[PDB]
Design a binder for this molecule. Structure first.
Ligand SMILES: CC(=O)SCCNC(=O)CCNC(=O)[C@H](O)C(C)(C)COP(=O)(O)OP(=O)(O)OC[C@H]1O[C@@H](n2cnc3c(N)ncnc32)[C@H](O)[C@@H]1OP(=O)(O)O
Ligand SMILES: CC(=O)SCCNC(=O)CCNC(=O)[C@H](O)C(C)(C)COP(=O)(O)OP(=O)(O)OC[C@H]1O[C@@H](n2cnc3c(N)ncnc32)[C@H](O)[C@@H]1OP(=O)(O)O
Ligand SMILES: CC(C)(COP(=O)(O)OP(=O)(O)OC[C@H]1O[C@@H](n2cnc3c(N)ncnc32)[C@H](O)[C@@H]1OP(=O)(O)O)[C@@H](O)C(=O)NCCC(=O)NCCS
Ligand SMILES: N[C@@H]1[C@@H](O)[C@H](O[C@@H]2O[C@H](CO)[C@@H](O)[C@H](O)[C@H]2N)[C@@H](CO)O[C@@H]1O
Ligand SMILES: N[C@@H]1[C@@H](O)[C@H](O[C@@H]2O[C@H](CO)[C@@H](O)[C@H](O)[C@H]2N)[C@@H](CO)O[C@@H]1O
Lengths: 316, 316
């Protein structure tokens, strides 16, 4: 049995599907999009029985800027780790993670995160992988709080437009909005979301995927919406195989800090959902939310669908 | 807004589906099956806007025997409670649950359970219903452990036969096994499972739905299995609309206490899954399991799919 770097994305996608595909159906298009476009120091280490892949770990160190933020090289990530069901409890997971962790630690990592990377597949350890929590505990990861993906069927319900002060207006992004959008993100969301707007617009995100809220001529918030015409496959639609026809998704969404708590996020969400509804979307996801924000989406009939546990190892 | 008793099952199912149907798709066949056949003192209270149903609660008191156990009238159950999404935060849920709890308390109930009733829909508060935990907490319910439905696709993996063992055979039940099964249940599982075997056989459970493990001549364990030909719709296949064409399920499963921890459960599971696999089952569920047994099913590639929180209120 040998541990070595692996390049065959198709073998990895198949092992993924065979083992967890019922709840996290992967495809090669998604896998390639997220692995290839990632800008971090990244690697896939495989475990092999002769020519046969029997396990893999995908892992990263934070080495590329996030908008205006410098990378923090002390942070590394376990994107994913799967050992094939016929080869469990032989120490292969341990070997794979020993290798990955040792590499990361030797390049200066002090904090190891389960998921939550750029171009992640998971915000944390999925509930469907709850038995792995013990695997991670044995290695010194600490189990923290939860994040959720929410689901709802926007075709089944109608809501009254929430009330708002005069002077605000929501519309799908137009090409001439790009400069205003970027100025707004540099001001209000100048880390990860800024970085993602920069990068995602280079690999197929289109203006039709973005909804903007303005106060008069100024951009004061946005959402990213998804349907089956989106070219860029973002987190709300990763698991689109589970969502049926006319799937969609919404996330992230953000309102300038000075404008928060006046009902403008509710208005943006409402109008974004109306857009999707008129696009004939049915089941759709809201990705990677926190418990205290579920009810914001809940009032629009979204419910928790998937849960992920944050988990962190501090290097001694 | 009037609160009164209802038996409009179609309206309840429609309101169920509109509100939570993306994750708990209900059909009228199941709803009628479970409600009409339950033998407890039971009731549905509806909330109405004129003639339009806008919420309901289904509740029960333990008044009917459970196998060898006489009933304990001190236990009551909230089967389900849903208020329509366009009528939330107006006091309707409070009024419905007040009406249920008052009636039950007036009939001697001291312990109120969320779910877990006979002919339940839910073993506890679903994770997709996590926001309702706040509503129940305020109302005196304590949040306790989780239970899980597991999911797996038995078409996707080949398993090795477990260590072959002298004396033991596993086969689908034949009609002449009836007496042997009942005597076994009377000995080893003489409460709820005995009760369900008796009752389910009267509403369309068939011998082909039962697998037995015998040591020589003696029944020492059983499983209840499900596919798309089962006429009795039991918990594993409640949510079959999520499970695709060739759906199935397995639960309950049990081995006589005397014979535990020697691999006979494993053997019974393996052979039950082989029978399903041969019946062309793909996606299938293992229902209402405790955390510490997940790994037993996990060996066969099952993963936690749905979580339910046990929750109990003690009347002061
Ligand atoms: C960021 C993320 O990737 S989250 C997703 C994690 N991945 C998954 O859940 C995918 C499905 N599961 C798997 O692929 C595997 O079970 C893995 C990767 C979690 C573990 O791989 P294995 O090769 O079986 O691990 P290994 O044999 O090294 O196990 C080492 C020890 O960790 C612990 N451990 C491993 N699996 C389990 C489990 N299911 N329950 C409890 N403890 C466990 C045990 O202490 C085990 O020692 P033991 O075998 O003496 O009990
Ligand atoms: C065993 C099981 O059934 S588990 C599944 C439980 N069901 C679900 O999760 C389904 C989805 N959710 C729902 O159907 C609902 O949210 C329910 C049933 C949980 C609650 O029903 P509602 O009708 O919204 O409840 P209700 O309005 O009485 O109370 C909610 C809150 O609004 C408050 N409220 C009451 N009137 C008003 C009002 N006029 N304005 C604003 N708030 C109000 C209540 O005081 C309560 O606050 P509190 O909990 O701090 O006391
Ligand atoms: C390593 O073994 P593995 O992960 O099973 O990969 P395989 O040997 O099946 O090769 C898969 C692909 O990765 C390529 N590959 C092999 N070693 C490589 C390396 N060091 N760098 C980049 N690509 C590599 C192979 O050429 C093959 O590519 P191709 O089919 O496009 O020529
Ligand atoms: N840094 C975390 C954010 O990343 C989280 O927000 C989530 O971010 C992802 C990745 O950009 C988006 O796709 C999601 O829509 C978004 N909710 C946030 C979650 O509360 O936690 C951190 O801030
Ligand atoms: N009394 C509880 C049992 O009922 C639970 O077992 C579960 O029971 C249901 C209904 O009989 C079956 O459909 C499930 O297959 C079975 N696992 C048990 C779960 O640990 O908790 C109690 O014992």
């Amino acid at each position: 049995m040998e541990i070595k770097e692996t390049y065959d994305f198709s073998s990895i996608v198949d092992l993924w599907n065979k083992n967890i595909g019922t709840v996290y159906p992967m495809n090669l298009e998604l896998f390639k999009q997220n692995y290839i476009n990632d800008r971090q120091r990244k690697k896939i280490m495989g475990a092999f029985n002769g020519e046969i892949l029997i396990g893999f770990v995908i892992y990263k160190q934070w080495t590329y800027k996030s908008g205006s933020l410098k990378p923090n090289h002390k942070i590394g990530y376990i994107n994913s780790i799967i050992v094939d069901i016929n080869f469990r409890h032989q120490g292969i997971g341990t070997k794979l993670l020993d290798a990955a962790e040792e590499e990361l630690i030797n390049s200066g990592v002090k904090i190891l995160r389960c998921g939550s990377d750029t171009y992640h597949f998971f915000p944390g350890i999925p509930l469907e992988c709850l038995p792995s929590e013990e695997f991670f505990l044995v290695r010194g990861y600490k189990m923290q709080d939860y994040f959720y993906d929410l689901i709802g069927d926007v075709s089944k319900v109608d809501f009254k437009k929430p009330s708002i002060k005069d002077g605000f207006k929501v519309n799908v992004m137009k090409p001439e909005d790009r400069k205003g959008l970027f100025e707004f993100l540099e001001k209000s969301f100048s880390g990860r979301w800024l970085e993602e707007f920069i990068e995602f617009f280079q690999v197929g995100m289109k203006e039709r995927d973005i909804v903007l809220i303005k106060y008069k001529t100024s951009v004061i918030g946005f959402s990213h919406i998804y349907d089956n015409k989106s070219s860029f496959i973002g987190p709300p639609i990763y698991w689109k195989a589970l969502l049926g026809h006319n799937y969609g998704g919404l996330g992230p969404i953000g309102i300038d800090k000075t404008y928060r708590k006046q009902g403008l996020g509710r208005l943006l969400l409402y109008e974004s959902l109306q857009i999707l509804k008129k696009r004939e979307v049915k089941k759709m996801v809201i990705d990677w939310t926190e418990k205290d924000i579920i009810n914001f989406y809940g009032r629009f009939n979204f419910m928790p669908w998937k849960a992920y546990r944050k988990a962190t190892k501090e290097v001694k």
